[PDB]
Design a protein around this ligand. Structure first.
Ligand code: BYN
Ligand code: BYN
Ligand code: 4LW
Ligand code: 4LW
Ligand code: K
Ligand code: K
Ligand code: K
Ligand code: K
Ligand code: MN
Ligand code: MN
Lengths: 500, 500
C-alpha cells in the first residue's frame, strides 16, 4: 500500500528519503526516547525510530518520533508532511494546505469495509494487557502521566450514527485499563461526547488507533466542519476509499493497517487526573493537574512489530506547530473566502508559536469594497473568532499582496512596520479563548474568554488607490538590468546551492 | 593609529579579518555601488570597498559600503561593530553595548587639539568644488536626491560653546554648494539648531566629517544625554583623548584623520526639498518630498585617496538596525536603571525592524517591589516614552530572567505566549511618536504623536512568588545526566562547528 495510506509504508518512505535514524540499541521510554525526539525537533534532524524500547513485550511497541516535524533543508523543509499526502517532498506549504482543503468541495468518498487487516495480527483481551506494563513514554520530566496518546486518532460517532469523527487529542495512562485525556469545547470529540451525555444511557463507544494512514492523521489534526466524517473527506482528498475493519468489541471501524488499536468507552460520567503536559506553546506548569475525561480500554489489537508514533511537543518545531497551526490556518483561509472576504492565503507563523495567523489580502478586491480598516478588521475578526477554526488563534494579522504569509520574516516585517499599536487593532474580549496559551489559562484574565485581536497591517492606500511605496530592498529599489548585472558579477567581484 | 581611532586603519582591519571585498574595476555610484551594498547587507557578506568609482576625480572619492553590518558567522556576527571599539571580533552584543555605556559614569576625556592631520592633505575652496560633480551615490532608485551623507558625523556647537554635538543625520546634495537633510526633534542637531534660531543672529557653524574614528561614529549614532559632548564621551570610552584639528573656515574641530570634511553653515532660515529616502524601516514612498534643513558648504578638505563610508539602508540588516536600534536599547537600559527600574538588559530585536525593545527584568527585584503588571507597565512606559532615548521605539516588551533579549526567537516566543493582547498592554497616545515608521507618518493617525505600547510578557507569578513553569524544551524538560547522555551518543546513533 502507498505511504500516504499505510503507516508502515510511510516509515519506509522516511528511510528511503534518508530522513530516518533507526536506533536498534535499548532506549528508555522514561524520558530518553522523548529527549532524543525533542532534540530532533529543535534541530530539524531525521526522525528517530526506536526499534529496541526498554519494556517492549510481545510486540508492543516500537516508537517513531517526530513524524510530522521539519527537515533541515529549505528545499524539502515540509517533506514529512508531503509524505503524508502523496505529494512530492519539495511541496510548498501552499501546495500541502491546498491538498488538505481540496476535499472541501468534493463529494465524500465513504470508506470500504474489509473483513480483516494487519491491525488484527495480534490481540489482547481485558485479562491479558496492563497499560501500566507497556513502554509508554514519559515525554517531559514534569508530566503528570505517561502520554501514550500524542499521535493516534480517536474515533467516536454521534448517537444517531450519522457522523463519525477522527481527531487527535492527548491522553495518558491512568491505570491498567484506563486513560485520561483532554476533551474540551469546541472540539468535535467534546461535541460528540455531549450528545451522548444528553442521551444519558451509555458511555461513548470509542476506539483509538495509532499508526493510522498518514493522510488520515492529517485530517484528524484539521478542523474540518462540524458533522463531516473525516474518513470520507480523506477518501475524497486521496481519490480512494479508505479500507476499514470493524472493532472486535464495538461497532466502530478502524483503518485496516493501523499499528495499534485500543477499543473501549469514553465515560459520560467519570473523570480522573489529567496533566500537566508539556504543551504546544512551549511550557509545562508542574503540578497543574485537572480532572480530564476517562477512557476505559477493553481490548488491544496490533500489527506484528507494531510502531507507536509519538510527538515530543513543546518549543519549535513539532507536529503541534506544523500540523495544528498550518491546518487551522488552511481552514481559516477557506472560512474567510466563504464569507466573501478577499483572503488569498493564511498561515500561522512559527515565530508566533502558532498563536497568530497572517491573512494575505487581495487588495484589488479590497479596494472595490470601499471600506475602512476599522470596519474590515471587525468583519474579519467576527468571522474567524466566532468559529471553531479560529479557536487556537489569538492574533490575526492582515497583510497586503506583497507579503508571503508563509515567510515569517516578512510577516514580522509587515506587522512591525504597518500596524500602529492600538489604533490599527481591534480587541475581541467576548469570544472563546484558548486556555492552553500561558497568558490565558495561567494569565491575568478569564482563561476561556477574550484575549484576541485583529491587527491590520494593511497600509491606508491599500483600501483606496493602491500601494504607494516601494521596499528599500535589493528586489524593489534597483532596476532589473542592474540587479541581474550584480548577480552575474557577484562571484567575479569576490562575494559568496538550492538542494543543500 | 589603532583601527577604532582611525578609519583608514579600520578598513585595513576589515581586510585582515577577511571581511572586505575590494572592487578595483569601475563601479557606478548611480545605484550600482548601493545595489551591491544592499545585497551584502541582505546576505551578511563581506563589506565592499569601491576603489574605482565612476566620477571620482582628484581623489574624491572611493566608497566603503556596509561599515557596521553583520557577518555571516554566528561566532563573529558583530565583528564589524567590535572593530569600531577595539573589542575582540567575537564580542557579544552585551559586551559591545556595555562598552558603549561605559563612559556614562566616567569623567569625560576632552579632545586634544593638534595643528594638522591627514584630513588636511587636500583642499578645495568655494571656487574649486561642485557637489553635483562628485561621485555621490544614488542609493535607492526612487530617492529624491543623491545621499552623500549616510555615515558621516555632523558637528554643531551650542551658541554658548559649552556643548559640541556629534551625530549622524542623513543629507543629500541640493546644488553645487548646498545639502538638504533631516533635522527633526528631539535630535540634538535640532536642539542646537533651535538655540541658534532663537538667538537669530547667524547661521549655525557646521562641519560634516566622513570617515571619522570608528569609535566616534558609534557615539554619533547613540542617544547619549543632552548637553554631553560626544568627543569627551568617546575619549573616556576609549581611554584616550581624541586628536582634533580646527576647520579652516570656522572654529569647529574635526577628527584629525577624517577622510573627508565639509565646512560651512546650517541655515537658521532656509529650507529645500529633501527626500524621499529608502529608510531604516524598509520603505520608500516615492514622491514624498518635504522641506528639510539646508546646509551651505564653503570648503572641502580630504585625505589622499579619500574613502566615503556609505549605508545602503533599508530591509534587514544594516547600520540603521545594528547601530540605531542597539545603541538606543543600550541607553534605554541605563535610563531604566537610573529610574530604579529592575532592568538588566535591553535590545531592539531585528525581527521588529528595531521598533521594539525587549527589556529583561530582574524578577527577584520585581518581586520585592510588590507591584502589578498595570502599575509596572505604566511606570516603564512613562520613563522610556517620555525620554529622547525612547523616541524611535514604539513597543516595549517586558520579559523575565529566563529570556535572552539578544535572541529574537526567544523574545518572539515570550511575547507571543506570555503577553495577553489588550489586557497585558498599556497604550501611550500622548507621547512623541517616530514619524518615519510607515504606520506613523503614512498611517491612519497623527504622524508625530502616540502609537506606542508597553507589552508585559511577565507571567503573573513573576510579580509574586516566582516562575511557576518549566519550558517544554530539551534544556528544561530533561535531567542533566540524560541530556548529556543524549549529546554524547548523538553522532553514534546517526544524527548530525562553532567558528563555521
Ligand atoms: C497534531 C496534534 C493535534 C492536537 C494535539 C497534539 C497533536 C500532535 C498533541 C501532541 C497530542 C497535543 C495536544 O494538545 N493535542 C490536542 C489537540 N486537540 C485537542 O482537543 N486536545 C489535545 O490534547 N490537538 C488538536 C486537534 O487535533 C485539532 O484541533 C483538530 O482540529 C481536532 O479535530 P476535530 O475536533 O476538528 O475533529
Ligand atoms: C547609524 C545611523 C543613524 C541615523 C541615520 C542613519 C544611520 C546609518 C542613516 C543611514 C543616515 C539614515 C538616517 O535616517 N539617519 C538619521 C538619524 N538620525 C536623524 O536625526 N536623522 C537621520 O536622518 N540617525 C540616528 C541618529 O544618529 C541617532 O538618533 C543619534 O542618537 C543622534 O545623535 P544625538 O542627537 O543623540 O546626538
Ligand atoms: O496538549 C497540547 O499541547 C495541545 F496542543 C492541546 C490542544 C491543541 C489544540 C486544540 C485544543 C487543545
Ligand atoms: O532616514 C532614515 O532612515 C532614518 F533612519 C532616520 C532617523 C533615524 C532615527 C532617528 C531619527 C531619524
Ligand atoms: K479532525
Ligand atoms: K495599518
Ligand atoms: K550622538
Ligand atoms: K503577561
Ligand atoms: Mn471533526
Ligand atoms: Mn548628542
Amino acid at each position: 500500500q502507498p505511504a500516504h495510506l499505510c503507516f508502515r509504508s510511510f516509515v519506509e518512505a522516511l528511510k528511503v528519503d534518508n530522513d530516518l535514524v533507526e536506533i536498534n540499541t535499548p532506549i528508555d521510554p522514561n524520558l530518553e526516547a522523548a529527549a532524543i525526539t525533542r532534540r530532533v525537533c529543535e534541530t530539524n534532524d531525521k526522525a528517530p525510530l526506536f526499534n529496541n524500547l526498554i519494556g517492549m513485550k510481545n510486540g508492543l511497541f516500537r516508537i517513531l518520533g517526530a513524524p510530522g516535524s521539519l527537515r533541515k533543508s529549505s528545499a524539502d523543509r515540509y517533506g514529512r508532511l508531503a509524505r503524508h499526502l502523496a505529494l512530492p517532498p519539495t511541496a510548498s506549504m501552499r501546495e500541502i494546505l491546498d491538498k488538505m482543503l481540496s476535499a472541501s468541495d468534493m463529494p465524500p468518498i465513504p470508506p470500504t469495509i474489509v473483513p480483516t487487516g494487519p491491525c488484527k495480527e495480534n490481540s489482547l483481551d481485558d485479562s491479558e494487557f496492563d497499560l501500566t506494563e507497556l513502554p509508554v513514554p514519559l515525554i517531559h520530566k514534569s508530566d503528570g502521566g505517561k502520554y501514550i496518546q500524542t499521535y493516534g486518532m480517536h474515533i467516536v460517532q454521534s448517537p444517531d450514527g450519522t457522523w463519525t469523527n477522527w481527531s487527535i487529542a492527548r491522553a495518558m495512562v491512568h491505570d491498567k485499563n484506563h486513560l485520561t485525556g483532554l476533551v474540551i469545547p469546541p472540539q468535535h470529540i467534546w461535541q460528540i461526547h455531549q450528545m451522548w451525555k444528553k442521551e444519558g444511557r451509555s458511555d461513548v463507544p470509542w476506539a483509538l488507533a495509532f499508526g493510522v494512514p498518514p493522510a488520515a492523521i492529517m485530517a484528524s489534526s484539521m478542523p474540518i466542519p462540524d458533522g463531516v466524517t473525516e474518513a470520507g473527506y480523506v477518501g475524497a482528498m486521496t481519490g480512494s476509499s479508505l479500507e476499514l475493519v470493524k472493532c472486535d468489541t464495538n461497532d466502530l471501524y478502524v483503518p485496516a493497517t493501523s499499528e495499534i488499536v485500543l477499543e473501549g468507552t469514553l465515560s459520560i460520567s467519570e473523570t480522573g487526573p489529567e496533566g500537566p503536559f508539556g504543551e504546544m506553546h512551549g511550557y509545562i506548569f508542574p503540578g497543574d493537574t485537572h480532572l480530564g475525561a476517562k477512557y476505559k480500554v477493553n481490548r488491544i489489537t496490533y500489527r506484528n512489530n507494531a510502531i507507536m508514533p509519538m510527538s515530543s511537543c513543546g518549543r519549535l518545531t513539532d507536529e503541534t506547530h506544523t500540523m495544528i497551526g498550518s491546518l487551522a490556518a488552511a481552514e481559516i483561509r477557506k472560512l474567510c473566502q466563504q464569507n466573501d472576504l478577499p483572503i488569498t492565503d493564511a498561515f500561522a507563523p512559527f515565530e508566533s508559536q502558532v498563536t497568530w495567523v497572517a491573512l494575505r489580502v487581495d487588495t484589488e478586491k479590497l479596494r472595490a469594497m470601499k471600506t475602512t480598516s476599522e470596519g474590515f478588521r471587525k468583519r474579519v475578526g467576527d468571522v474567524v473568532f466566532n468559529h471553531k477554526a479560529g479557536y487556537t488563534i489569538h492574533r490575526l494579522v492582515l497583510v497586503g499582496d506583497d507579503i508571503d504569509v508563509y515567510e515569517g520574516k516578512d510577516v514580522l516585517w509587515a506587522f512591525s512596520t504597518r500596524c500602529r499599536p492600538g489604533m490599527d487593532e481591534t480587541l475581541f474580549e467576548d469570544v472563546r479563548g484558548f486556555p492552553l496559551i500561558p497568558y490565558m489559562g495561567h494569565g491575568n484574565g478569564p482563561a476561556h474568554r477574550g484575549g484576541k485581536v485583529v491587527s491590520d497591517a494593511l497600509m491606508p492606500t491599500e483600501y483606496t488607490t493602491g500601494r504607494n511605496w516601494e521596499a528599500a530592498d535589493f528586489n524593489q529599489s534597483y532596476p532589473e538590468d542592474l540587479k541581474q548585472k550584480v548577480l552575474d558579477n557577484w562571484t567575479k567581484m569576490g562575494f559568496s546551492h538550492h538542494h543543500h
